[PDB]
Symmetry: C5
């Protein structure tokens, strides 16, 4: 089998569509997601044309091996898609209608800057390479692009699944290549981060601030050091669910800043004890009273600054 | 091979059945389960009809390649099922009896709202896409739906395995689609959660309340902060066995609430010490005595409210 | 190819044997084990009979496709076995000798009640489904059941590998099915649990009891709470190596009971401090002295009771 | 099919190229990375030459089975590459242009000496084994070596992808072998290590040094021991992301050195308390005051020495 | 295809060789390692004799399916090897030279008694089962046994790769089996265990001994209990990298012994406090002073005894 010959010198247009059946395993660390979908393909092959009257059939079914089928690949996949051909239908003018159901693990970079209040644009890049006989170009049949209502991505809200209609045509290894960009827009369900990470992290921090109403150095050291350790545990927990980024994430920024608050609270607790030992408690009392206001105030203002820089 | 032609204009009815052999790996985080089962298919193919008197044979056995077989797929699977054809039998009237043994990983969302006292309805969706020649519709042969007595799903009780007899017939990409819903009803074995998570978590909380019978600030800080850290460990343990949900789970609610109790206990311990230092212990004594009753009482009432909202 | 036809109306007897080459990956959480073995099959196919004199051979070697072979399956496997046919030999009277080497992941429930001093009976269920033409029954050739001397299952002692000679014959979807039960009896190597989990857990508990020779509330709180946290770590460690069971395991029972001892030790430490503050130390001394005997005594008796209930 | 015969006695030159499409999963512990790329092959097969004016076709497209193709393998792969042939083009003179898209898991040792400020040279070794008929030698077509602009390796910066043009030709098992070295130069994005590991580790160390402004032994013991435990947690965290090396890494060296600082701080805290108990506080004061300067100074100088030895 | 016929009554000798290309993933817990190697096979099949004059060629190249190939298997593999035939060369007398490149996961028990200062002998067992026509025996072609210079096993030093030239010929299920033992001698790179586990574990132990220069019970309890918890963390860390053994490992013995030292240190700290409270500090001072010498001395002697028993 060889590609359909051109009537003049036109390129062969392969109309494409992706209909999402399943979306699962969005792995943040790996920056991958798994997809199960219908891939539809359509092109004209004159050599397969027939007369409906003398045939007695309005449509003709073929096995993939019997006819020429464009070698369509995905750019951003780990391994080649697992595909099973569903149907191949030919109309009288030789218009081929191809349908396969496939599953693939897609590599798509994620921007963690606003995590866990982030939104992403996942990409599925469709590609075809041209042959010596003719140049093969991809198009989007919008009537064949969509997603099942039951499509759920655990921990995310699916906003839209659209295709950029104009392909990116370019040369690669002395042949032209036609690339389509299918975009799946998603937004993270931040809900669970609030009772599981955010609030627990704030509670332990506020507990360290009770040291500003205590003159007991031994108790103060216990309050600040114990909560710091619990903060380290949350830092470790958070970083294990995320990849290493060459930039600061919103959560990473807050987590890092909270260390500074623990560090300054230890300085305050130290200074307070030092003055008490030096028989200067009136002074220590002035520093401690100021700290009661300064710590929550600087914490609120630093958070307003951070939220501003990130959102 | 082509589909059996209609005598009139009727759709082809494919009778189905699923007999569960094995159920394993119910993964809460992934919202998946693995299944090993018999899939039975039955349809009439008049082209295969024969005479039983002259053939001397009551049944004819065919190899899958020799005859037309409907392309039946599962909707909610990760990858296409791993199937091995067991038997194909044709009766004299041309009724085909197909049997395969398959294994598949099924995506089925779980409702964690009542965790670990939750029940689930797992779904296995069977599907067939109509061909151009004719419309294919699915039916349930209840005589061929069931499960082996030895079917066990570790950590769960299997209640029932039934099929919704009426298929969901709908158009998808300009063809008809016929979908059947096989339902596996299960209830979680909550037993182990009691000695492993629930009771240990209650013991550490009750240990924090011994601070209400102590005037030692240093010891109190140690009691409340140490148990809080142990509570954090249980929170982390629990959340690692669960996916992130856009709702509160029953266990999540209790775990979150317990932080408030630790926070208020720290306030009490702080207020008590502050008054003692200010030479007001009679007052501190009134707050501490009230706390001895208030803490267990508010804990019980808050739990009654939560159990009511969730069950 | 079709099954051997019956001389009268007898079922076809397929003689079986399993010879274990490798046993590995006994996963307690998954309740699975991996096996690599020889599967031997033997049956009479008269159509294959020959005269040794005429042919000039005592045996005939065929390829699997050339002759009829029974469709033998394993019941309790994750996926169908990975098999490679080793040999097919036909004797003059049509006695077929089939040999394959296979590997499979077996699902076999485990009874954790006596963990880590438990013994198990792993099962490998062999099955055959009858055909329209012939009822197929399985038998055990004891001469072909065994295991290699080098067969080792890490963390277990292999006791015996035997087959229940009488198959379990039953109807499944209007066809006879013949099931054989191959049993691999194993006993857990409990050795390592002693220095790694049991003794460390006892040491920290005994360390909490040193609080009965101390009047220092602050030191007592540190002793009991710190060791309780270390006990929580062991509880978590143990539960990660085990599945969730709807029953108490021996280790689970001891681990749970030890929490009660920590809880009562905190009550004692609290009561002691309370009396000391109330200027009643003579009393506190009576409770503390009683506790020094009561705690180890009640611990020993409770352990005797538990060992009795479990063994 | 057999290899193209030599006109004289020359070896067959197979021109190669690798064009990277995807780079993912650089696993530090495993010392592996996954690759998805185009592999291009070119050689002269005179038996395939044709007339351009007579044939009318400028290029002939063959199926892999139809012609002889060199058996090209990767040396440093876990399993054989997953490959799909894209195109085979023959020019009139018999110059074959072969193109496949492959995916593979590559074993490439990493030098962790300067971690997390390390750079690596990943290798992909291409190999061909000669046949009895003739010797096969590999060459690099630089025009067909490259990488897609979108190629991203999470946590790394990609510097260059080049090939050492001269193959390593050697005898192995009495036949010639021709090996090419494709080099992917990368540098680690150390950014995230600063707020996640480095700074938190420095903060806890500096917190241990507040004990030099405290006379409270009980508080000092709490400060030094608590922070030491947090240092152990960071040591464990770091070592889990790295393989075991027969050399010290930069981070490993700093982490190890910090233990010595904790050990000496405990000695200081002990010596200070001992002198205070012996009624020699003036002296303890001399040691403590010296420690305030000595600890940060020795820490800075030791770090300058270490950075010098490693960079 | 059938086996080559015997000229007399001799068994068919299949000469073997294994040339290691890659060694990776030595998993201590699983007691497995992955291998990528050349497997060479050589046997005489006179039925394949040819005249170079008539056929033109000096050596014939065959496809595996075209000729008889001995069914060679590995005994100690998880699954059957992934093999790719590189060449099948037949010389005029009928001597076949078979070459394949394979990858396999090998089960080979490890002796952890001296861990992490242990050495191992990994085995790769090659096997052939005899057929009816004739008995097959394996031999080692030493000229075809070896390893690539670049063969590295992360965390190990490779000493030698040799074959026991004499096969183990034995009866199995009424047929002969011929087994060869390929041995890969390795020694563990213990380096990293010193700064990561050994020294940190010794530092925390020595820190607990500072309690022998302190009269502060509250500080002593903190020193001994905190370092004990850090010791538990190292115990858990070590045991996660190792399988459960029915014997004591060297590291396991040291780790276990260190618990006894913590237990006795708690007794000492308790006894000291008890005497101080009873107004007997002179006695307490005698016990504490003795402990300063006894603890490091008994620790050194116990380690000399342990090293002697293990090495
Ligand atoms: C610790 C500090 C407290 C956490 C700060 C909240 C984060 C935030 O400010 O979140 C803000 C985001 C909304 O972002 P958006 O509309 O998606 O961004 C795009 C917006 N632009 C394009 C205009 C820039 O989420 C929320 O709905 C807030 C819910 C979080 C409540 C946390 C309470 C505790
Ligand atoms: C701290 C709070 C402790 C947890 C309290 C139990 C939670 C609960 O209330 O559990 C209730 C569930 C029963 O649920 P159900 O009948 O399946 O629900 C469906 C019923 N509808 C449809 C009527 C709403 O479990 C039990 O049998 C309780 C036994 C566990 C006791 C744990 C003791 C500790
Ligand atoms: C904390 C309490 C300490 C743990 C108590 C040991 C558990 C036990 O009681 O173990 C008992 C089992 C014996 O089991 P069996 O004979 O196989 O069972 C079948 C018996 N029937 C049929 C009679 C019921 O193992 C042992 O040899 C125990 C040796 C380890 C001692 C632990 C040292 C600490
Ligand atoms: C505790 C001590 C803190 C860590 C010290 C920095 C490590 C270092 O010295 O880092 C040095 C590397 C630069 O490396 P380079 O030029 O690529 O090396 C190759 C150069 N040769 C060939 C000349 C040798 O990183 C940096 O850019 C420094 C940024 C890190 C700041 C960390 C602050 C905390
Ligand atoms: C805590 C106790 C400290 C552990 C002491 C080292 C263990 C040991 O004794 O290690 C010994 C092994 C050498 O063993 P070998 O020659 O391979 O054994 C075979 C010997 N036969 C055949 C004679 C029996 O390692 C070494 O090279 C020593 C380096 C380790 C230094 C650790 C410093 C801390
Ligand atoms: Cl693809
Ligand atoms: Cl399916
Ligand atoms: Cl099977
Ligand atoms: Cl390869
Ligand atoms: Cl093998
Ligand atoms: Na085609
Ligand atoms: Na068919
Ligand atoms: Na057959
Ligand atoms: Na070829
Ligand atoms: Na303390
Ligand atoms: Na063969």
């Amino acid at each position: 089998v060889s590609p359909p010959p051109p009537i003049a010198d036109e390129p062969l247009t392969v109309n494409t569509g992706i209909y999402l059946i399943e979306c699962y395993s969005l792995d943040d660390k790996a920056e991958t997601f798994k997809v199960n979908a219908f891939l539809s393909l359509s092109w004209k092959d004159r050599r397969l044309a027939f007369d409906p009257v003398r045939s007695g059939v309005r449509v003709k079914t073929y096995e993939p091996e019997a006819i020429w089928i464009p070698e369509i690949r995905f750019v951003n996949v780990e391994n080649a898609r697992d595909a099973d051909v569903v149907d191949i239908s030919v109309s009288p003018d030789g218009t081929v209608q191809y349908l396969e159901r496939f599953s693939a693990r897609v590599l798509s970079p994620l921007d963690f800057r606003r995590y866990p209040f982030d939104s992403q644009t996942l990409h599925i890049y469709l590609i075809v390479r041209s042959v010596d006989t003719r140049n093969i170009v991809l198009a989007v049949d919008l009537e064949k692009v969509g997603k099942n209502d039951d499509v759920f991505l655990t921990g995310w809200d699916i906003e839209s699944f659209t295709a950029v209609v104009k392909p990116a045509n370019f040369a690669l290894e002395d042949r032209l290549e036609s690339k389509l960009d299918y975009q799946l827009r998603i937004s993270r369900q931040y809900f669970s981060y609030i009772p599981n990470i955010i609030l627990p992290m704030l509670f332990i921090l506020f507990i360290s601030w009770t040291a500003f109403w205590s003159t007991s150095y031994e108790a103060n050291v216990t309050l600040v050091v114990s909560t710091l350790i619990a903060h380290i545990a949350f830092n470790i927990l958070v970083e294990t669910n995320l990849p290493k980024t060459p930039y600061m994430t919103y959560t990473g920024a807050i987590i890092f800043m909270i260390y500074l608050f623990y560090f300054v609270a230890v300085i305050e607790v130290t200074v307070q004890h030092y003055l008490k030992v030096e028989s200067q408690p009136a002074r220590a009392a002035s520093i401690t009273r100021a700290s009661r206001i300064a710590f929550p105030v600087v914490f609120l203002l630093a958070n307003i600054i951070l939220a501003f820089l990130f959102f």
